[PDB]
Amino acid sequence: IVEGSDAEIGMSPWQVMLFRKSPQELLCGASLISDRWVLTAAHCLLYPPWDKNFTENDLLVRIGKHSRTRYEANIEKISMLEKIYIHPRYNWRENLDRDIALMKLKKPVAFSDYIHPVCLPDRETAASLLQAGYKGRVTGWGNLKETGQPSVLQVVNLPIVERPVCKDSTRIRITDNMFCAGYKPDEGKRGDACEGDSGGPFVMKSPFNNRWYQMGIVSWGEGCDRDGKYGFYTHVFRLKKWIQKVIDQFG
Amino acid sequence: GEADCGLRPLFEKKSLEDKTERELLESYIDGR
């Protein structure tokens, strides 16, 4: 996270850390949507161009963390993966379209003050909240700038950008399955997501029921915090159908 | 439909707001 600030203890209880077993290392961010399901970006688990193709046993999931490195005994929970689910039409070849994946935990995790599931968006939430100009929140333990490591979970709120702008800001092709956020040149304010933050949640608080909804997943970008540039996120609602399908099918 | 999802134990549950929470709240007006 660039131009963000230290998160408060438990202000993002659904934040998940995707961890590589050997060698040990932080791979990506992710989120808890149930006591047994974790949501993340597909490119975090599968990206052939770099030979990326992690499987159930190559990873671990660390929930309820705050510190970037400190072992928070009996607070954070380390869970094993029972099965990985990658969207069948995930396009890693051209633009990471439908960059979304699910991971079922071997054993359900117990909720606490530091571990609690976020809400998925539904039609009403999506139609009213996903609007250019509105701010959302991104969090993670990613770099503090382009290739740099926070000692604690970082947080940054970012305004959603009108689709046209998102397009005319990159030569890569945008889908309806993605959206972009970030500040524009003029409005003297900075901030963006960066490597390590991928797979993480973009959330928004409902002004009606006061709950938090993960409207997006940190998907990709071209560098970090650079004028005329914006971060792109997987459009969660647009792919909720697939989500519901996998959860219901494998329960 | 949504049970407990989205309500933080150390915040919403305790009627406590986090530091930047209303920046988002205010962005719905699109300014002030």
mmCIF file of C-alpha atoms in Angstrom:
data_model
loop_
_atom_site.group_PDB
_atom_site.id
_atom_site.type_symbol
_atom_site.label_atom_id
_atom_site.label_comp_id
_atom_site.label_asym_id
_atom_site.label_seq_id
_atom_site.Cartn_x
_atom_site.Cartn_y
_atom_site.Cartn_z
ATOM 1 C CA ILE A 1 0.000 0.000 0.000
ATOM 2 C CA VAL A 2 1.378 3.371 -1.094
ATOM 3 C CA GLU A 3 0.544 6.638 0.687
ATOM 4 C CA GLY A 4 -1.549 4.759 3.213
ATOM 5 C CA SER A 5 -1.282 4.546 6.982
ATOM 6 C CA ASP A 6 -1.019 1.943 9.732
ATOM 7 C CA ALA A 7 -4.311 0.144 10.216
ATOM 8 C CA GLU A 8 -6.000 0.122 13.613
ATOM 9 C CA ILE A 9 -6.175 -3.150 15.527
ATOM 10 C CA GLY A 10 -9.040 -5.134 14.049
ATOM 11 C CA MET A 11 -10.285 -2.535 11.562
ATOM 12 C CA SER A 12 -10.127 -5.209 8.850
ATOM 13 C CA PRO A 13 -10.867 -8.582 10.586
ATOM 14 C CA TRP A 14 -11.502 -10.297 7.243
ATOM 15 C CA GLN A 15 -8.016 -9.524 5.955
ATOM 16 C CA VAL A 16 -6.167 -12.688 5.010
ATOM 17 C CA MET A 17 -2.515 -13.272 4.276
ATOM 18 C CA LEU A 18 -1.725 -15.825 1.565
ATOM 19 C CA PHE A 19 1.497 -17.624 2.487
ATOM 20 C CA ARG A 20 3.938 -19.800 0.553
ATOM 21 C CA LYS A 21 5.199 -22.767 2.595
ATOM 22 C CA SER A 22 8.684 -23.260 1.162
ATOM 23 C CA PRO A 23 10.351 -20.947 0.731
ATOM 24 C CA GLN A 24 8.457 -18.976 3.368
ATOM 25 C CA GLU A 25 7.070 -15.736 1.943
ATOM 26 C CA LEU A 26 4.077 -13.431 1.715
ATOM 27 C CA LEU A 27 2.399 -14.075 -1.633
ATOM 28 C CA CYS A 28 -0.794 -12.042 -1.623
ATOM 29 C CA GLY A 29 -3.656 -10.563 0.312
ATOM 30 C CA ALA A 30 -7.046 -12.282 0.529
ATOM 31 C CA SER A 31 -10.275 -12.143 2.500
ATOM 32 C CA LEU A 32 -12.460 -14.198 4.804
ATOM 33 C CA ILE A 33 -16.066 -14.451 3.621
ATOM 34 C CA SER A 34 -17.052 -17.425 5.754
ATOM 35 C CA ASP A 35 -15.588 -19.632 8.488
ATOM 36 C CA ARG A 36 -14.393 -21.939 5.725
ATOM 37 C CA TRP A 37 -14.026 -19.805 2.579
ATOM 38 C CA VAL A 38 -11.315 -17.391 1.509
ATOM 39 C CA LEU A 39 -11.495 -15.100 -1.510
ATOM 40 C CA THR A 40 -8.463 -13.909 -3.482
ATOM 41 C CA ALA A 41 -7.136 -13.132 -6.965
ATOM 42 C CA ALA A 42 -6.577 -15.953 -9.454
ATOM 43 C CA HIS A 43 -3.211 -14.559 -10.534
ATOM 44 C CA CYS A 44 -2.064 -15.115 -6.954
ATOM 45 C CA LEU A 45 -2.447 -18.864 -7.412
ATOM 46 C CA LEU A 46 -2.172 -19.287 -11.155
ATOM 47 C CA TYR A 47 -0.058 -17.338 -13.621
ATOM 48 C CA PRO A 48 1.641 -19.688 -16.158
ATOM 49 C CA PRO A 49 3.763 -16.865 -17.656
ATOM 50 C CA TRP A 50 5.901 -17.152 -14.507
ATOM 51 C CA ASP A 51 5.190 -20.853 -13.984
ATOM 52 C CA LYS A 52 2.883 -19.888 -11.128
ATOM 53 C CA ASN A 53 0.613 -22.838 -10.357
ATOM 54 C CA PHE A 54 0.399 -23.272 -6.580
ATOM 55 C CA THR A 55 -1.668 -26.122 -5.174
ATOM 56 C CA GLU A 56 -3.409 -26.911 -1.876
ATOM 57 C CA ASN A 57 -0.224 -27.974 -0.035
ATOM 58 C CA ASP A 58 2.164 -25.297 -1.334
ATOM 59 C CA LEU A 59 0.314 -22.693 0.718
ATOM 60 C CA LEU A 60 -1.030 -21.657 4.094
ATOM 61 C CA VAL A 61 -3.507 -18.967 5.078
ATOM 62 C CA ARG A 62 -2.854 -16.607 7.994
ATOM 63 C CA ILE A 63 -5.956 -14.943 9.414
ATOM 64 C CA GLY A 64 -6.359 -12.223 12.023
ATOM 65 C CA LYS A 65 -2.903 -10.715 11.614
ATOM 66 C CA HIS A 66 -1.794 -7.119 12.098
ATOM 67 C CA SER A 67 1.994 -7.245 12.170
ATOM 68 C CA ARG A 68 3.838 -7.840 8.904
ATOM 69 C CA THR A 69 6.266 -10.330 10.491
ATOM 70 C CA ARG A 70 5.551 -10.772 14.206
ATOM 71 C CA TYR A 71 3.982 -14.096 15.228
ATOM 72 C CA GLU A 72 0.749 -13.146 16.999
ATOM 73 C CA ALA A 73 0.210 -16.320 19.017
ATOM 74 C CA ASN A 74 -3.340 -17.344 19.862
ATOM 75 C CA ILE A 75 -4.628 -14.310 17.980
ATOM 76 C CA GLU A 76 -3.794 -15.089 14.370
ATOM 77 C CA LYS A 77 -4.880 -18.399 12.895
ATOM 78 C CA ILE A 78 -2.885 -20.470 10.436
ATOM 79 C CA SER A 79 -5.137 -22.574 8.216
ATOM 80 C CA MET A 80 -4.454 -25.218 5.588
ATOM 81 C CA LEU A 81 -6.122 -25.351 2.179
ATOM 82 C CA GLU A 82 -8.519 -28.182 1.408
ATOM 83 C CA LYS A 83 -9.163 -27.168 -2.199
ATOM 84 C CA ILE A 84 -8.479 -24.305 -4.615
ATOM 85 C CA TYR A 85 -11.098 -23.012 -7.074
ATOM 86 C CA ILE A 86 -10.114 -20.794 -9.989
ATOM 87 C CA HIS A 87 -12.687 -19.178 -12.275
ATOM 88 C CA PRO A 88 -12.959 -21.362 -15.425
ATOM 89 C CA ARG A 89 -12.839 -18.335 -17.726
ATOM 90 C CA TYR A 90 -10.018 -16.511 -15.922
ATOM 91 C CA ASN A 91 -7.960 -14.820 -18.667
ATOM 92 C CA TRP A 92 -4.297 -14.803 -17.586
ATOM 93 C CA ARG A 93 -3.156 -14.539 -21.206
ATOM 94 C CA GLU A 94 -4.185 -10.987 -22.019
ATOM 95 C CA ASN A 95 -5.562 -8.911 -19.172
ATOM 96 C CA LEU A 96 -6.398 -11.087 -16.159
ATOM 97 C CA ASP A 97 -10.138 -10.908 -16.841
ATOM 98 C CA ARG A 98 -12.209 -12.591 -14.125
ATOM 99 C CA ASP A 99 -9.176 -12.526 -11.800
ATOM 100 C CA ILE A 100 -10.848 -14.363 -8.931
ATOM 101 C CA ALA A 101 -10.344 -17.542 -6.927
ATOM 102 C CA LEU A 102 -11.696 -19.321 -3.873
ATOM 103 C CA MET A 103 -9.971 -21.536 -1.327
ATOM 104 C CA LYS A 104 -11.762 -23.856 1.071
ATOM 105 C CA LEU A 105 -10.072 -24.271 4.439
ATOM 106 C CA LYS A 106 -9.449 -27.810 5.710
ATOM 107 C CA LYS A 107 -11.109 -26.874 9.006
ATOM 108 C CA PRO A 108 -13.487 -23.991 9.806
ATOM 109 C CA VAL A 109 -11.875 -21.070 11.609
ATOM 110 C CA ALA A 110 -13.281 -19.586 14.821
ATOM 111 C CA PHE A 111 -14.278 -15.925 14.688
ATOM 112 C CA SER A 112 -12.883 -13.428 17.173
ATOM 113 C CA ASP A 113 -12.388 -9.720 17.624
ATOM 114 C CA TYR A 114 -9.649 -10.011 15.026
ATOM 115 C CA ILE A 115 -11.224 -12.602 12.742
ATOM 116 C CA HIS A 116 -14.624 -11.899 11.180
ATOM 117 C CA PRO A 117 -16.084 -12.281 7.648
ATOM 118 C CA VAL A 118 -16.779 -9.412 5.246
ATOM 119 C CA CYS A 119 -19.996 -9.195 3.193
ATOM 120 C CA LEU A 120 -20.195 -10.025 -0.461
ATOM 121 C CA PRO A 121 -22.120 -7.415 -2.488
ATOM 122 C CA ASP A 122 -25.579 -8.102 -3.879
ATOM 123 C CA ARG A 123 -27.412 -6.309 -6.711
ATOM 124 C CA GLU A 124 -28.612 -3.418 -4.497
ATOM 125 C CA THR A 125 -25.182 -2.854 -2.974
ATOM 126 C CA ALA A 126 -23.440 -3.010 -6.342
ATOM 127 C CA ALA A 127 -25.901 -0.703 -8.125
ATOM 128 C CA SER A 128 -25.767 1.951 -5.408
ATOM 129 C CA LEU A 129 -22.214 1.753 -4.106
ATOM 130 C CA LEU A 130 -20.014 1.027 -7.124
ATOM 131 C CA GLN A 131 -20.061 4.568 -8.502
ATOM 132 C CA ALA A 132 -17.249 6.784 -9.780
ATOM 133 C CA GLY A 133 -16.365 9.415 -7.208
ATOM 134 C CA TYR A 134 -17.203 7.194 -4.251
ATOM 135 C CA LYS A 135 -14.335 6.007 -2.081
ATOM 136 C CA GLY A 136 -13.540 2.452 -1.105
ATOM 137 C CA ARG A 137 -10.864 1.025 1.161
ATOM 138 C CA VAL A 138 -7.903 -1.169 0.265
ATOM 139 C CA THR A 139 -5.637 -2.905 2.743
ATOM 140 C CA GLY A 140 -2.603 -5.155 2.683
ATOM 141 C CA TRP A 141 1.001 -5.838 3.606
ATOM 142 C CA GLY A 142 2.288 -4.953 0.164
ATOM 143 C CA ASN A 143 5.163 -2.623 -0.693
ATOM 144 C CA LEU A 144 5.153 1.076 0.216
ATOM 145 C CA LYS A 145 6.294 1.958 -3.318
ATOM 146 C CA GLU A 146 7.282 0.389 -6.661
ATOM 147 C CA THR A 147 9.961 -2.277 -6.046
ATOM 148 C CA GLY A 148 9.256 -0.866 0.962
ATOM 149 C CA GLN A 149 7.696 -3.248 3.476
ATOM 150 C CA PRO A 150 5.307 -2.049 6.229
ATOM 151 C CA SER A 151 5.799 -3.427 9.732
ATOM 152 C CA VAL A 152 2.037 -3.337 10.098
ATOM 153 C CA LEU A 153 -1.085 -3.715 7.935
ATOM 154 C CA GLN A 154 -1.615 -0.614 5.788
ATOM 155 C CA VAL A 155 -4.912 1.056 4.840
ATOM 156 C CA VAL A 156 -5.877 3.575 2.174
ATOM 157 C CA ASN A 157 -9.202 4.859 0.851
ATOM 158 C CA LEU A 158 -9.454 5.382 -2.891
ATOM 159 C CA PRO A 159 -12.101 6.992 -5.100
ATOM 160 C CA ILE A 160 -13.638 4.870 -7.851
ATOM 161 C CA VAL A 161 -12.932 6.216 -11.346
ATOM 162 C CA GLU A 162 -15.401 6.523 -14.224
ATOM 163 C CA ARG A 163 -14.932 3.689 -16.728
ATOM 164 C CA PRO A 164 -14.026 5.978 -19.669
ATOM 165 C CA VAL A 165 -11.120 7.429 -17.697
ATOM 166 C CA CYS A 166 -9.975 3.946 -16.678
ATOM 167 C CA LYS A 167 -9.826 2.979 -20.365
ATOM 168 C CA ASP A 168 -8.209 6.129 -21.738
ATOM 169 C CA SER A 169 -5.527 5.678 -19.084
ATOM 170 C CA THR A 170 -4.069 2.403 -20.309
ATOM 171 C CA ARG A 171 -3.628 0.487 -23.555
ATOM 172 C CA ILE A 172 -4.605 -2.775 -21.856
ATOM 173 C CA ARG A 173 -8.229 -3.751 -22.388
ATOM 174 C CA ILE A 174 -10.762 -3.322 -19.605
ATOM 175 C CA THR A 175 -13.731 -5.641 -19.034
ATOM 176 C CA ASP A 176 -17.030 -5.195 -17.222
ATOM 177 C CA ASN A 177 -15.547 -7.719 -14.801
ATOM 178 C CA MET A 178 -13.150 -5.084 -13.483
ATOM 179 C CA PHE A 179 -13.068 -1.489 -12.303
ATOM 180 C CA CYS A 180 -10.452 1.088 -11.393
ATOM 181 C CA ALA A 181 -9.817 3.351 -8.412
ATOM 182 C CA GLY A 182 -7.212 5.903 -7.443
ATOM 183 C CA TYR A 183 -6.701 9.653 -7.482
ATOM 184 C CA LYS A 184 -6.419 11.805 -10.595
ATOM 185 C CA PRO A 185 -3.422 14.132 -11.178
ATOM 186 C CA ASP A 186 -5.004 17.447 -10.115
ATOM 187 C CA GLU A 187 -6.667 16.646 -6.751
ATOM 188 C CA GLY A 188 -3.481 16.774 -4.671
ATOM 189 C CA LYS A 189 -3.928 13.368 -3.015
ATOM 190 C CA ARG A 190 -2.049 10.123 -3.541
ATOM 191 C CA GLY A 191 -2.321 6.439 -2.770
ATOM 192 C CA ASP A 192 -2.522 3.094 -4.517
ATOM 193 C CA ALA A 193 -2.181 -0.634 -3.982
ATOM 194 C CA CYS A 194 1.138 -2.272 -4.754
ATOM 195 C CA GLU A 195 2.855 -5.652 -5.122
ATOM 196 C CA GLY A 196 2.013 -7.890 -2.193
ATOM 197 C CA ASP A 197 -1.442 -6.316 -1.917
ATOM 198 C CA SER A 198 -2.861 -8.305 -4.846
ATOM 199 C CA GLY A 199 -5.683 -10.664 -3.945
ATOM 200 C CA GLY A 200 -6.630 -8.245 -1.191
ATOM 201 C CA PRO A 201 -10.062 -6.645 -0.640
ATOM 202 C CA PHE A 202 -11.474 -3.350 -1.834
ATOM 203 C CA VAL A 203 -14.316 -2.675 0.596
ATOM 204 C CA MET A 204 -17.057 -0.107 1.097
ATOM 205 C CA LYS A 205 -19.295 0.697 4.014
ATOM 206 C CA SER A 206 -23.026 0.731 3.378
ATOM 207 C CA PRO A 207 -24.669 4.013 4.400
ATOM 208 C CA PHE A 208 -27.898 2.074 4.962
ATOM 209 C CA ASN A 209 -27.073 -0.959 7.102
ATOM 210 C CA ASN A 210 -23.606 0.095 8.263
ATOM 211 C CA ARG A 211 -22.011 -3.169 7.052
ATOM 212 C CA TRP A 212 -18.834 -3.556 4.966
ATOM 213 C CA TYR A 213 -18.914 -5.107 1.480
ATOM 214 C CA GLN A 214 -16.004 -6.330 -0.600
ATOM 215 C CA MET A 215 -16.778 -4.630 -3.908
ATOM 216 C CA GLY A 216 -13.451 -5.667 -5.362
ATOM 217 C CA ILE A 217 -10.172 -7.553 -5.248
ATOM 218 C CA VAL A 218 -6.791 -5.917 -5.947
ATOM 219 C CA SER A 219 -6.156 -7.296 -9.433
ATOM 220 C CA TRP A 220 -3.516 -5.373 -11.373
ATOM 221 C CA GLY A 221 -1.915 -2.152 -12.443
ATOM 222 C CA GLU A 222 1.052 -0.638 -14.223
ATOM 223 C CA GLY A 223 3.447 0.437 -11.504
ATOM 224 C CA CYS A 224 2.337 1.998 -8.223
ATOM 225 C CA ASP A 225 1.145 5.514 -7.440
ATOM 226 C CA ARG A 226 2.000 7.207 -10.746
ATOM 227 C CA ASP A 227 -0.013 10.130 -12.139
ATOM 228 C CA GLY A 228 -2.346 9.199 -14.983
ATOM 229 C CA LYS A 229 -2.431 5.672 -13.601
ATOM 230 C CA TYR A 230 -5.073 3.755 -11.674
ATOM 231 C CA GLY A 231 -5.386 0.438 -9.898
ATOM 232 C CA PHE A 232 -7.706 -2.226 -11.264
ATOM 233 C CA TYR A 233 -9.889 -4.501 -9.230
ATOM 234 C CA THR A 234 -11.920 -7.602 -9.925
ATOM 235 C CA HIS A 235 -15.626 -6.670 -10.016
ATOM 236 C CA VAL A 236 -16.838 -9.034 -7.288
ATOM 237 C CA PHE A 237 -20.586 -8.703 -7.815
ATOM 238 C CA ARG A 238 -20.256 -9.378 -11.550
ATOM 239 C CA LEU A 239 -18.747 -12.731 -10.617
ATOM 240 C CA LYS A 240 -20.820 -13.505 -7.532
ATOM 241 C CA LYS A 241 -22.838 -16.068 -9.466
ATOM 242 C CA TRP A 242 -19.757 -18.246 -9.861
ATOM 243 C CA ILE A 243 -18.989 -17.638 -6.193
ATOM 244 C CA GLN A 244 -22.419 -18.810 -5.061
ATOM 245 C CA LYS A 245 -22.153 -21.770 -7.428
ATOM 246 C CA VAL A 246 -18.875 -23.065 -5.976
ATOM 247 C CA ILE A 247 -19.840 -22.525 -2.345
ATOM 248 C CA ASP A 248 -23.234 -24.198 -2.710
ATOM 249 C CA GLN A 249 -21.805 -27.084 -4.733
ATOM 250 C CA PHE A 250 -18.915 -27.882 -2.399
ATOM 251 C CA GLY A 251 -20.452 -27.546 1.050
ATOM 252 C CA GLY B 1 -29.575 -13.150 4.241
ATOM 253 C CA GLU B 2 -26.387 -11.662 5.604
ATOM 254 C CA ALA B 3 -26.267 -12.795 9.268
ATOM 255 C CA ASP B 4 -23.121 -11.194 10.886
ATOM 256 C CA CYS B 5 -21.012 -10.526 7.843
ATOM 257 C CA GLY B 6 -19.544 -6.994 7.587
ATOM 258 C CA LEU B 7 -19.881 -5.959 11.258
ATOM 259 C CA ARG B 8 -16.517 -5.568 12.999
ATOM 260 C CA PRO B 9 -16.346 -6.716 16.675
ATOM 261 C CA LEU B 10 -14.063 -3.849 17.720
ATOM 262 C CA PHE B 11 -16.049 -1.208 15.858
ATOM 263 C CA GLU B 12 -19.613 -1.539 14.554
ATOM 264 C CA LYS B 13 -20.326 -3.962 17.417
ATOM 265 C CA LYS B 14 -19.057 -1.400 19.937
ATOM 266 C CA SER B 15 -20.546 1.621 18.166
ATOM 267 C CA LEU B 16 -17.009 2.874 17.503
ATOM 268 C CA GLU B 17 -15.754 4.392 14.260
ATOM 269 C CA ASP B 18 -12.244 3.968 12.906
ATOM 270 C CA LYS B 19 -10.060 6.952 11.963
ATOM 271 C CA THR B 20 -10.838 7.196 8.240
ATOM 272 C CA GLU B 21 -14.263 5.550 8.199
ATOM 273 C CA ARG B 22 -16.186 8.751 7.475
ATOM 274 C CA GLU B 23 -13.944 9.792 4.605
ATOM 275 C CA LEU B 24 -15.800 7.032 2.756
ATOM 276 C CA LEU B 25 -19.123 8.128 4.281
ATOM 277 C CA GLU B 26 -18.600 11.682 3.064
ATOM 278 C CA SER B 27 -17.493 10.628 -0.426
ATOM 279 C CA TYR B 28 -21.098 9.613 -1.149
ATOM 280 C CA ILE B 29 -22.026 13.273 -1.121
ATOM 281 C CA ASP B 30 -19.031 13.564 -3.492
ATOM 282 C CA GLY B 31 -17.439 16.270 -1.427
ATOM 283 C CA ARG B 32 -19.017 18.017 1.495
#
